[PDB]
């Protein structure tokens, strides 16, 4: 510890919130990454696994659940800026087996903004593409697509599937061979390789049992990423235009364009998977804006779309049965936070701690 040194000042703030958070929620391990003024700070806490004990280190991989959806959006945006995908086209334009179904009237933008009306969870009995297509061909929403926001793993699945196909590849190839490499995220995976399994934290469920997420159909798009806080902090910096990014100009454009605001719903603006609130934001409104995961709300189009903004709080939560993650960043302040935990603890706490940390900077 050193008085007047960046990493010690930030560490005091972070420790003072994260240690009680982990204690009260029985969280075995966390990593918290913060960026401010172009400098990066990584704080590791506790255990990646209990027995045999393994500490959280700079290499620890956590499941991040719905943070995975922002990668599906970044891929769709990359396909769009590359001229391969139009977001306003129908889903059945790109998925011809769905022509003549409800997907004639659902746009790619709808599935990228949770406004198709598809439900949250993939039906558990859908095991293969044939069954998935039969389901989708027979599906109808209660309200017309574009009228309501319903956060959806299925819709995110379609977004990523369509984006990858428009690029000529499977979603897994698109993510692990194109997107994550171009972002410099070398410790981020949809399938953790053998040399990294020692670094893959165990998640701890509500009954404190060690678990890892079970990957099912279109799961890569919706919840498949395992990653480090450092890689996600790089992703936050790239989302703020801070990195050279290997001169990948289309990729920077793709990242930035995911922040385009397409629908208003409640306190939030729904971007392409990212969600944002006006900055400065009150904590009550940020809490409300992060309590939209499982209920339908009215959605209102923003047309022409709101361009990517600086003066906003951009965020996404993600969870699996054993993990709880959160990212927030404020481009106008070039500041951001990644909080990764191997227990799924309540979103109100994630958001409140992040709000307090970023407010301190």
Automatic annotation (TrEMBL):
Query: Which Gene3D superfamilies does the record cross-reference, listed alphabetically?
Result: DD-peptidase/beta-lactamase superfamily
Q: Name one Pfam family in it.
A: Beta-lactamase
Q: Name one GO molecular function term.
A: beta-lactamase activity
List, alphabetically, the InterPro entries matched. AmpC (IPR058136), AmpC-like (IPR050491), Beta-lactam-related (IPR001466), Beta-lactam/transpept-like (IPR012338), Beta-lactam_class-C_AS (IPR001586)
Zinc: is it a keyword of this entry? no
| BP term (GO), one | antibiotic catabolic process
Q: Where is it found, in Gene Ontology cellular component terms?
A: outer membrane-bounded periplasmic space
Q: What's the catalysed reaction?
A: a beta-lactam + H2O = a substituted beta-amino acid
Q: Where does AMP bind?
A: 66, 151, 216, 319
The keyword Transcription appears for this protein: no
Q: What is its EC number?
A: 3.5.2.6
Q: Which domain of life is it from?
A: Bacteria
Q: Where is the Beta-lactamase-related domain?
A: 14-359
Q: Which UniProt keywords apply?
A: Antibiotic resistance, Hydrolase, Nucleotide-binding, Plasmid, Signal
Q: Which family does it belong to?
A: Belongs to the class-C beta-lactamase family.
**By its UniProt entry, which PANTHER family does this protein fall under?**
BETA-LACTAMASE-RELATED, D-ALANYL-D-ALANINE-CARBOXYPEPTIDASE/ENDOPEPTIDASE AMPH
Protein name (record): Beta-lactamase
User: Whose protein is this, by species?
Assistant: Klebsiella pneumoniae
List the taxonomic lineage: Bacteria, Pseudomonadati, Pseudomonadota, Gammaproteobacteria, Enterobacterales
């Amino acid at each position: 510890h050193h008085a007047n040194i960046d990493e010690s000042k930030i560490k005091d703030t972070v420790d003072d919130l994260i240690q009680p958070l982990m204690q009260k929620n029985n969280i075995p391990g966390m990593s918290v990454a913060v960026t401010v003024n172009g400098k990066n700070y990584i704080y590791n806490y506790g255990l990646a696994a209990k027995q045999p004990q393994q500490p959280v280190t700079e290499n620890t991989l956590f499941e991040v659940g719905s943070l995975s959806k922002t990668f599906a959006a970044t891929l769709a945006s990359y396909a769009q800026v590359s001229g391969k995908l139009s977001l306003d086209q129908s889903v059945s334009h790109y998925v011809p087996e769905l022509r003549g179904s409800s997907f004639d009237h659902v746009s790619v933008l709808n599935v990228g903004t949770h406004t198709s009306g598809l439900q949250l969870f993939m039906p558990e009995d859908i095991k293969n593409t044939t069954q998935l297509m039969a389901y989708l061909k027979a599906w109808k929403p209660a309200d017309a697509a574009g009228t309501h926001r319903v956060f959806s793993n299925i819709g995110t699945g379609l977004l990523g599937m369509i984006a990858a196909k428009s690029l000529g590849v499977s979603y897994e190839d698109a993510i692990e061979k194109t997107l994550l490499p171009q972002l410099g995220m070398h410790h981020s995976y949809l399938k953790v390789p053998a040399d990294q399994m020692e670094n893959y934290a165990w998640g701890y469920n509500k009954k404190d049992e060690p678990v890892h997420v079970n990957m099912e159909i279109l799961g890569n798009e919706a919840y498949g990423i395992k990653t480090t806080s450092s890689d996600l902090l790089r992703y936050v910096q790239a989302n703020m235009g801070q990195l050279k990014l290997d001169a990948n100009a289309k990729m920077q454009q793709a990242l930035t364009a995911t922040h385009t605001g397409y629908f208003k719903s409640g306190e939030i603006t729904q971007d392409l998977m990212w969600e944002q609130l006006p900055y400065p934001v009150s904590l009550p409104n940020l809490l409300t804006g992060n309590d939209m995961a499982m209920t339908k709300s009215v959605a209102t189009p923003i047309v022409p779309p709101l361009p990517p903004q600086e003066n906003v709080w951009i965020n996404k939560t993600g969870s699996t049965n054993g993990f709880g993650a959160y990212i927030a960043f404020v481009p106008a302040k070039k500041m951001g936070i990644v909080m990764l935990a191997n227990k799924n603890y309540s979103i109100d706490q994630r958001v409140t701690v992040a709000y307090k940390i970023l407010s301190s900077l």
